[PDB]
């Protein structure tokens, strides 16, 4: 439709107003003393969140020119959430600081393109200094501290996440879901579990739990439906005289085949259980091969040349124990060669590097966890749904931060890392090619103080006095906003992932640097 065009300052003030409105709303949630934001939902039950990205994504402005500034800053937090899962409030605060400091130099007649080039130069220098300051996250105590800080000073969330990573290791997968109790509980699933139940209640061998336990069973992997008996009989006979139970993992077992297995279960002639093959489509084939590799067997399929009638005991997989519940079975330990299992894990992690969809590596990581790790489930306990959602977001944020901590290391928290990195970068000779680029550097030098200033401002203290005292100190010296005391940030437990800090600064600089270079804005004209 018709477009309204704004130029020069008239365009920039509208853009900055949209930046400030979004960033001020996100500002309120920053730091240990930050407060919650309520966002109304169309379907009722407003969400109470302390996450910057959650608040930013719900902000839209009636003024279309102010909306562009909000929309561009909104995706600073979106990118930070995508790459780090934490620090979205810090990224939004940094982006506003760059815009606020940069607009002063734009109003001073300085070339905004050279300001952007100076901003990029300063951010590159500071990020390099962050790498030097960063220290590896080795101890599980540091993991608890990182999780506690990211869960808004919740030691229970930090401790349960540290326990989860200890149990499942680096290769494990941790998920968060609603709990039934009022307390957080951690459930760890070891081995391979593919969340598929038995096809008949008569497979149960002990009625105490309504589960089907098979000790040292054979596992038959089949990629096609099983309905008749004449094909299952040759392998059933081979299982029969060995005395071991048989677990049949196929697409479906109905009709004569299902009846024969059920009949032999009641009569006690041959103990067995049948489960549906997990997954749909090609994913079903993938995990079926993984089970065969894990169990030291081969998936019987005419697509590979194997036949069910010609299937032998050597082709069948083996395990020490498997238990089949109403809706899931767990293979306690496969009999496959660990060298083949490690090779299979290597192949999947190579595929992980090539995954293109969000659910692609997520399921790929689940397969790796099933093979050479574990799956941990954190059930968040809360009295009401509104508190459950707020707690789950904090647990998810703490999980993302702890993952970022082991990936890239830890730095002192409370905005100290950016200040220490800035001083190291300046001491290393950070300079631009022209006075406009020097001003762009000075924009970033002032901007990196903003996360500490807004943390202190939310705590009710004086940001400028605290920042000056922190800059007087060296190393991990910082200000604890929770207790209002100065001290060693690492000793006091205020830890930040260096990946989160680096991502927040880089995302903020890229967007806010572009915002300084805007001279004209085009939006759809209002409908009179």
């Amino acid at each position: 439709a018709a477009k309204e065009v704004k130029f020069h300052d008239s365009a920039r003030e509208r853009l900055v107003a949209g930046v400030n409105l979004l960033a001020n709303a996100v500002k309120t949630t920053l730091g240990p003393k930050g407060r919650n934001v309520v966002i109304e939902r169309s379907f009722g039950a407003p969400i109470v969140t302390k996450d910057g990205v959650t608040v930013a994504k719900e902000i839209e402005l009636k003024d279309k020119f102010e909306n562009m500034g909000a929309q561009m800053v909104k995706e600073v937090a979106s990118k930070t959430a995508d790459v780090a899962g934490d620090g979205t409030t810090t990224a939004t605060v940094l982006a506003q600081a760059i815009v606020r400091e940069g607009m002063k130099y734009v109003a001073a007649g300085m070339n905004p393109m050279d300001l952007k080039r100076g901003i990029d130069k300063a951010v590159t220098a500071i990020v390099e200094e962050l790498k030097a300051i960063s220290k590896p996250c080795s101890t599980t105590k540091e993991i608890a501290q990182v999780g506690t800080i990211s869960a808004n000073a919740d030691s229970s969330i930090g401790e349960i996440i540290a326990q989860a990573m200890d149990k499942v290791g680096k290769e494990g997968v941790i998920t968060v879901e609603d709990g039934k109790s009022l307390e957080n509980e951690l459930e760890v699933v070891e081995g391979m579990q593919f969340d598929r139940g038995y096809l008949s209640p008569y497979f149960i061998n002990n009625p105490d739990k309504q589960v089907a336990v098979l000790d040292n069973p054979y596992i038959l992997l089949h990629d096609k439906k099983i309905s008749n008996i004449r094909d299952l009989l040759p392998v059933l006979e081979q299982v029969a005289k060995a005395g071991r139970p048989l677990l049949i993992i196929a697409e479906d077992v109905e009709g004569e085949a299902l009846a024969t297995l059920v009949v032999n279960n009641l009569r006690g002639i041959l103990k067995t259980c049948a489960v549906k093959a997990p997954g749909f489509g090609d994913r079903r084939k993938a995990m079926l091969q993984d089970i065969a590799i894990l169990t030291g067997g081969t998936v019987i399929s005419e697509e590979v040349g194997l036949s069910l009638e010609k299937a032998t005991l050597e082709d069948l997989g083996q395990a020490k124990r498997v238990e089949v519940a109403k809706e899931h079975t767990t293979i306690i330990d496969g009999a496959g060669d660990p060298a083949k299992i490690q090779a299979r894990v290597k192949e999947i992690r190579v595929q992980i590097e090539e995954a293109t969809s969000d659910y692609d590596r997520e399921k790929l990581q689940e397969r790796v966890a099933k093979l050479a790790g574990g799956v941990a489930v954190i059930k968040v306990g809360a009295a009401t749904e509104v508190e459950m959602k707020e707690k789950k977001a904090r647990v998810e944020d703490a999980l993302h931060a702890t993952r970022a901590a082991v990936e890239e290391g830890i730095v002192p928290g409370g905005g100290v890392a950016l200040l220490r990195a800035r001083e190291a970068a300046v001491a290393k000779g950070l300079k631009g090619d022209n006075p406009d680029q020097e001003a762009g550097i000075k924009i970033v030098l002032r901007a990196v103080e903003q996360p500490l200033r807004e943390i202190v401002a939310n705590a009710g203290e004086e940001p400028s006095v605290i920042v000056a005292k922190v800059l007087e100190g060296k190393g991990n010296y910082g200000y604890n906003a929770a207790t209002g005391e100065f001290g060693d940030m690492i000793e006091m437990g205020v830890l930040d992932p260096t990946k989160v800090t680096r991502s927040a600064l880089q995302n903020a600089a890229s967007v806010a640097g572009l915002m300084l270079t805007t001279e004209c804005m085009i939006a759809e004209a209002p409908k009179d």
Partner: protein, 94 residues
């Protein structure tokens, strides 16, 4: 074990070839079922209209070729055996 009657011949259909001239392995599903097999039991012969029996052109031991349409599989002690009339065997190999 199995004794045919009149013109009936019992044949064990041979396995579909697995290797080739160059050694290429064909999967059992892909391998077409051959129309040949060796004879295990032979009948006395069809009673022609004037009495007596028709001399049989196949004796127990030879390899015979039969049409795919003809024959019936018998379930005794597990092995698959094809029982069919004498006229369906169209040739004898070696």
């Amino acid at each position: 074990k199995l004794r045919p009657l009149h013109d009936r011949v019992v044949v064990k259909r041979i396995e579909a070839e697995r290797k080739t001239a160059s050694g290429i392995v064909i999967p059992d599903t892909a391998g077409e079922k051959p129309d040949q097999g060796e004879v295990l039991a032979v009948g006395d012969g069809k009673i022609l209209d004037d009495g007596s029996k028709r001399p049989m052109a196949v004796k127990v031991g030879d390899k015979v070729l039969f049409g795919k349409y003809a024959g019936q599989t018998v379930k005794v002690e597990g092995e698959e055996l094809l029982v069919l009339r004498e006229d369906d065997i169209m040739a004898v190999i070696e």
